[PDB]
Amino acid sequence: LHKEPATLIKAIDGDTVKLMYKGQPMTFRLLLVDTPEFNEKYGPEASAFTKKMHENAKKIEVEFDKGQRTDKYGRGLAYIYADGKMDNEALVRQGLAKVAYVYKGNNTHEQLLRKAEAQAKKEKLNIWS
Ligand SMILES: Cc1cn([C@H]2C[C@H](OP(=O)(O)O)[C@@H](COP(=O)(O)O)O2)c(=O)[nH]c1=O
Ligand SMILES: [Ca+2]
16 A cells, blocks of 8 residues: 545535545545534544644555545545645544444454554543543
């Protein structure tokens, strides 16, 4: 798997973001995670966490997995990195997302994320308190 450039266009919520990728605007959905929707508990905090991660980044990258690159809604499915740090991992480690939507063939970073989730639950963070 490999990292490719992208630039912020705009925040959407905890697990979706609008990025410019290969010079085209696209909505991206983070692989292997589920943040609460804005209107749910820890939804606002998830959206704030991801928004901040992308605003503060000098460099954003997207990394597709081996399988499907777009979902049925036309959203890109990727691991996204902010200054080298994986958003997907960072959300789970903070208890602001669960591991979820693990489909065969797009699951390269599953166990990395599950390790992060175990550590978040151990610490009873956010969604696990
Ligand atoms: C994360 C992810 C979501 N999805 C689809 C499945 C879900 O379909 P349904 O909308 O039919 O439930 C939906 C969940 O996204 P959200 O969690 O953003 O709503 O997006 C994928 O198909 N592939 C994926 O890798
Ligand atoms: Ca969600």
